[model samples]
Target: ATQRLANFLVHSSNNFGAILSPTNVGSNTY
Candidate 1:
C-alpha cells in the first residue's frame, strides 16, 4: 500500500509538472 501510494503521488506530480511547464515557460518568455 505504501509503495502504491508513493507511485501514485509521483505519477500525479509528473503529470502536473508536464502540464504546467509549458505554460510557465510561455508566460516567462512573454
Candidate 2:
C-alpha cells in the first residue's frame, strides 16, 4: 500500500500546488 499512498500524495500535491501556483504545479516535485 506504500505505492498507492505515494501516488495519492503525488496527486494531492499536484492539485494543491495547482491551486497555489498554476505555473509551478509539477515543478515542486523535488
Candidate 3:
C-alpha cells in the first residue's frame, strides 16, 4: 500500500537523515 510505504519511508528518512547528516535532504523525498 502507498500509505504503508510512506510510513516506512518516514522512519527510514529520519534514520537516513541522521546517519547521513545533511545529505539525506537530497536523497530522500519522504
Candidate 4:
C-alpha cells in the first residue's frame, strides 16, 4: 500500500509542478 501511495504522489507531484503550475513549491504538500 505504501508503494502505491508513493507512486500516486509521484504523478500528483508532477501534475502540481508541471500541470497545475502551483503558486508555491510547498503547494503539493511534499
Answer with 2 or 3, whichever has the higher lDDT. Answer: 3
lDDT of 2 by residue, 1-30 (tens): 354434333343435543564554444353
Off by over 4 Å in 2: 1-19, 24-30
- Top model by TM-score, which number? 4
Q: Model 1 scores what on Cα lDDT?
A: 0.32
Please say which candidate is ahead in TM-score: 3 or 4. 4
Q: Candidate 2: global Cα-lDDT?
A: 0.43
lDDT (Cα, tens digit) per residue for candidate 4, span 1-30: 354454233334445344564554434544
lDDT-best of 1 and 4: 4
Q: What TM-score against the true fold does each predicted structure earn?
A: 0.11, 0.11, 0.12, 0.14
Each candidate: how many clashes? 0, 0, 0, 0
lDDT of each: 0.32, 0.43, 0.45, 0.43
lDDT string for model 3 (1-30, tens) is 354434334435335443554544436554
- In model 1, the worst 10-residue window by lDDT is 5-14
lDDT: worst 10-residue window of model 3:
5-14
Return the candidate ranking by TM-score, descending.
4, 3, 1, 2
Assess candidate 2 and give its TM-score to the true structure. 0.11
Clashing pairs in 3: none
Q: Which TM-score value belongs to model 4?
A: 0.14
**Candidate 1's TM-score:** 0.11
**Residue 9 of model 3: what lDDT?**
42
Candidate 1 residue pairs that clash: none
